[PDB]
Design a protein around this ligand. Structure first.
Ligand SMILES: *SCCNC(=O)C(C)(C)Oc1ccc(Cl)cc1
Ligand SMILES: *SCCNC(=O)C(C)(C)Oc1ccc(Cl)cc1
Ligand SMILES: [Mg+2]
Ligand SMILES: [Mg+2]
Lengths: 236, 5, 236, 5
């Protein structure tokens, strides 16, 4: 790797600078280098890794959606043949998106997940695994589409099982996992009722636990609870 | 799109 | 070039798609490929080229400024030594920015400018040459800094001479050239009085010519005139 | 920063 010669601490420092400069591709490359040093990541470092790749893939997904919409309109009746260019360029963006997802999944499988024993690390990484399979599922159309969807489901489900046993209902990672798995149900698995039930039960169980929290923890938990409520409002 | 984190 | 196998028309089509998807690095790569086909560019194609690179380099400049500010604060008295990382990362972004500027200047010199005979093409390309030397000047510190500044000045000056002879005072390219050359005077050449005089005289001479224009041309010209006014308000 | 086009 091109980051193999840079100190771990320097990679982390530069990831933080890249975040300040909104240079998310750089941030992701620095964090990939840090992961590849082979040591486990701290809570803050896991956040740097996830923020970097979430921003990179989020931009790719937004671009893919723009191009896919143009492509769909081009294939409507009465539209003029514009040639292969829209499909080609959508495919180019799609292939780059798949490459980034494969890279993240590769870091998780070699070897972040297998060395993650605490709930706060293991749930976070398994949630990421579900997220990146979900992004692959958003663009999938081939023989393996059902297996891609099931890979996302399986990762989210393992994260859910651990989170319910090992974290309080207000834990922000537990809440964010539930938020995203609920979106998986709604958008990917054609299961809007499961999506709504999960978001509602998660919200209600968190509400009942807020009384145990400090002011700062309350702010953290209610932030994610509001996202669950926002999705429920969208879906009902 | 719905919210994810 | 990696675009050598793609049709000119397909590169232009994909540049437009990349713009819609806000994929400006792709847009610039497609337009570089189109330029390298060796044919002159139309007015619309010149705009695609300039928009693509303006957005790429604009993002690099914003990131460079963030990192340079951090670097300056790190070199103040009482600040803790953080190591070489801030300088290294600022240098990384700076080198990438210089590479993009060199690429644009290379397209202009091989061979867009020499085949541009009409004022609307030649002024536009010479303005771009001034702009990209100006971006090089923003980061320059070495033996060649004065020559870089003078290269920007010389390109802007040739564009100005042509624009005053061959374009009406309301022509948007003439106005945008004056806007940017005025910024060059203020920010690069330490000549705020020249910057203010140029912006004011350009604005006033355009105002006096608006009566000749259609409603649509009036909208185009007044848009750039407002930018001149905005800069004058900032500077006075 | 001042405006440029
Ligand atoms: S890990 C990045 C820092 N955290 C966040 O940006 C917010 C969205 C405030 O919190 C969470 C992010 C991810 C999870 Cl799984 C939970 C909370
Ligand atoms: S060339 C890109 C299309 N034009 C523009 O975005 C605006 C800013 C409206 O007009 C000008 C751009 C560049 C020049 Cl030199 C003049 C006007
Ligand atoms: Mg494909
Ligand atoms: Mg340098």
């Amino acid at each position: 790797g091109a980051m193999g010669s840079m100190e771990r601490a320097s990679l982390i420092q530069k990831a933080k600078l890249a975040e300040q400069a909104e240079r998310y591709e750089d941030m992701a490359a620095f964090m990939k280098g840090a992961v590849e040093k082979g040591e486990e990541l701290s809570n803050e470092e896991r956040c740097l890794l996830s923020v970097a790749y979430k921003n990179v893939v989020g931009g790719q997904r937004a671009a893919w959606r723009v191009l896919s919409s143009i492509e769909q309109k081009s294939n409507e009746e009465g539209s003029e043949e514009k040639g292969p260019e829209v499909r080609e360029y959508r495919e180019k963006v799609e292939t780059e998106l798949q490459g980034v997802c494969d890279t993240v999944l590769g870091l998780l499988d070699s070897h972040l997940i297998k060395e993650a024993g605490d709930a706060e690390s293991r749930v976070f990484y398994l949630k990421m695994k579900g997220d990146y399979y979900r992004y692959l599922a958003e663009v999938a159309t081939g023989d393996d589409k059902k297996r891609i969807i099931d890979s996302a489901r399986s990762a989210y489900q393992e994260a859910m099982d651990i989170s319910k046993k090992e974290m309080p209902p207000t834990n922000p990672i537990r809440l964010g996992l539930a938020l995203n798995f609920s979106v998986f149900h709604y958008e990917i698995a054609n299961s809007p009722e499961e999506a709504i039930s999960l978001a509602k039960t998660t919200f209600d169980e968190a509400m009942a636990d807020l009384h145990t929290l400090s002011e700062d923890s309350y702010k953290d938990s209610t932030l994610i609870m509001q996202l669950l409520r926002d999705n429920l409002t969208l879906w009902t | 799109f719905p919210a994810t984190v």
